[PDB]
Amino acid sequence: SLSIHQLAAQGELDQLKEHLRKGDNLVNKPDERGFTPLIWASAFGEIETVRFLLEWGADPHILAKERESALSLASTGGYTDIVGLLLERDVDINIYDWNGGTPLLYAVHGNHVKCVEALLARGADLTTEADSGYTPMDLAVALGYRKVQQVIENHILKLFQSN
Amino acid sequence: PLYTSPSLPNITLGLP
């Protein structure tokens, strides 16, 4: 009697598959906050559920009511492999939510070094100030996250060279 | 067993 969102959240994949039997638009049904089964699975790091949902027709681009995305929820949790699966479907990497974040800013804020590296490698923007007045490097510096700062630096040096 | 909603943190909490 758990909802599809809870089944996704808890990695109850056999039950989720049975529930999605019909292969209809259930896979993208938003809950009361606009969260899809994919956004719940991403938030809780349930990679095999994410993989199945994408294969079954889940739309990774859907934003919840306050502009939360599967990508941002994966980034705040440090789920680098989920981030990668989502980036493969060409989701917007610079999604600005109403909480004042972006995927990169959540990866920085969580000191998720490999997540930061993944997002940068796919071309996440560094040049833009968040609503709070912080660029991603500004935030890494303020938080004292030196490993994140280094990954940002490595990337920035590559950007002013075209050859 | 009900898991809490997906949440995004306040990224400038405690900062200037």
Domain ranges of chain A: 1-163
Chain B environment of A39 (Cβ under 8 Å): 6
Reported residue count of chain A is 163
Q: Give the integer Cα–Cα distance in Å for A1 and A89.
A: 32
Could you tell me the CA-to-CA distances from A8 to A4, A29, A76, A134 in Å, in that order?
6, 12, 18, 34
Q: Which of A154, A56, A21, A117 is nearest to A103 (CA)?
A: A117
Q: Give the integer Cα–Cα distance in Å for A91 and A18.
A: 28
Determine the distance in angstroms separating the CA of B11 from the nearest CA of chain A, rounded to an integer. 6
The approach used to solve this structure was X-ray
Using the structure block, give the residue that is written with the tokens 């999604």: A95
Q: Give the integer Cα–Cα distance in Å for A156 and A65.
A: 33
Resolution in angstroms comes to: 1.9
Interface of A with B in 33-92 (CB under 8 A): 33, 35, 39-40, 42-44, 64, 68, 72-73, 76
A95 in helix, strand or coil?
coil
CATH number of A1-163, picked from 3.10.620.30, 3.90.660.10, 1.25.40.20, 1.10.540.10:
1.25.40.20
* Cα end-to-end span (Å), chain B: 39
Check residue A91 and report its DSSP letter: -
